[PDB]
Ligand binder design. Structure first.
Ligand SMILES: N=C(N)c1ccc(C(F)(F)F)cc1
Ligand SMILES: N=C(N)c1ccc(C(F)(F)F)cc1
Ligand SMILES: [Cl-]
Ligand SMILES: [Cl-]
Ligand SMILES: [Cl-]
Ligand SMILES: [Cl-]
Ligand SMILES: [Mg+2]
Lengths: 142, 133
């Protein structure tokens, strides 16, 4: 692991714990797999702890961010979820799935024009026709 | 950075005119070549209101000037996700990806501009990069 001075330096420098290899890679994989297990088992509170832990460890990991965003969406913290989905989109650049879920969140936030803009962005830019079918099903419902 | 601040804020939990004032001051610094002071002001603005495309775009431009190409690209992508209709961030992401030795990502950015932007001057610029790729 990392000595305390190295962890403190990372806190003070704005760096991730990932950047200083504070926990072995295999253990982080285990933690992600357990977080997914909790999620799939309906243990949302525990899944939330684990996805928060993962995102503290590496705020630039798209899948860690996507997991927490999904949990926030389930818990109806729609603005926090939308905020994380936007970050997740930016980090991956290529995948419009977070923009699709942002659209769902915006509908629940009573921002239907923002939602429409999200679904249209998916339709116009994604080459994933299966995702477009889902986005189009929201757009057609208006 | 600004992205890490946005993520940490989400993990854990001023009149528009005044914000407009500070944005203009940051631009004033930028235009005089006071890049470091402009960067502080844009970083401040992105802490106060990160999901504001004008603040993101200004900070991303400074990172691009400073050859911090990955940070710039990440911020331009946020701006595009939030704004959706302006392809200027996609165009600059393409430039950044070229400098990051990611020519296929760059090509995808410039193609998006040509296919979707209504900014004819931006489309010429994107095509000139494509011709070099
Ligand atoms: N419906 C089409 N003809 C069509 C064209 C382009 C794309 C894109 F390249 F954007 F993925 C997706 C679908
Ligand atoms: C699945 C699904 C759920 C809701 C809608 C909407 F309410 F937006 F129409 C569309 C598709
Ligand atoms: Cl120690
Ligand atoms: Cl990238
Ligand atoms: Cl709206
Ligand atoms: Cl444009
Ligand atoms: Mg056109």
């Amino acid at each position: 692991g990392s000595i305390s001075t190295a962890v403190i330096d990372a806190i003070n420098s704005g760096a991730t714990l990932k950047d200083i290899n504070a926990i072995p890679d295999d253990m982080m994989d285990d933690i992600y797999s357990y977080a997914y297990d909790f999620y799939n088992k309906g243990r949302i509170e525990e899944a939330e702890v684990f996805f928060r832990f993962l995102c503290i460890y590496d705020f630039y990991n798209v899948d860690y961010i996507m997991g927490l965003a999904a949990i926030y969406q389930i818990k109806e913290q729609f603005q926090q979820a939308a905020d994380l989905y936007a970050v997740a989109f930016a980090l991956g650049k290529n995948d419009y799935t977070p923009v699709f879920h942002t659209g769902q969140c915006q509908l629940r936030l009573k921002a239907p024009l923002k939602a429409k803009e999200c679904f249209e962005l998916v339709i116009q830019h994604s080459n994933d026709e299966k995702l477009k079918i889902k986005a189009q099903s929201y757009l057609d419902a208006i």
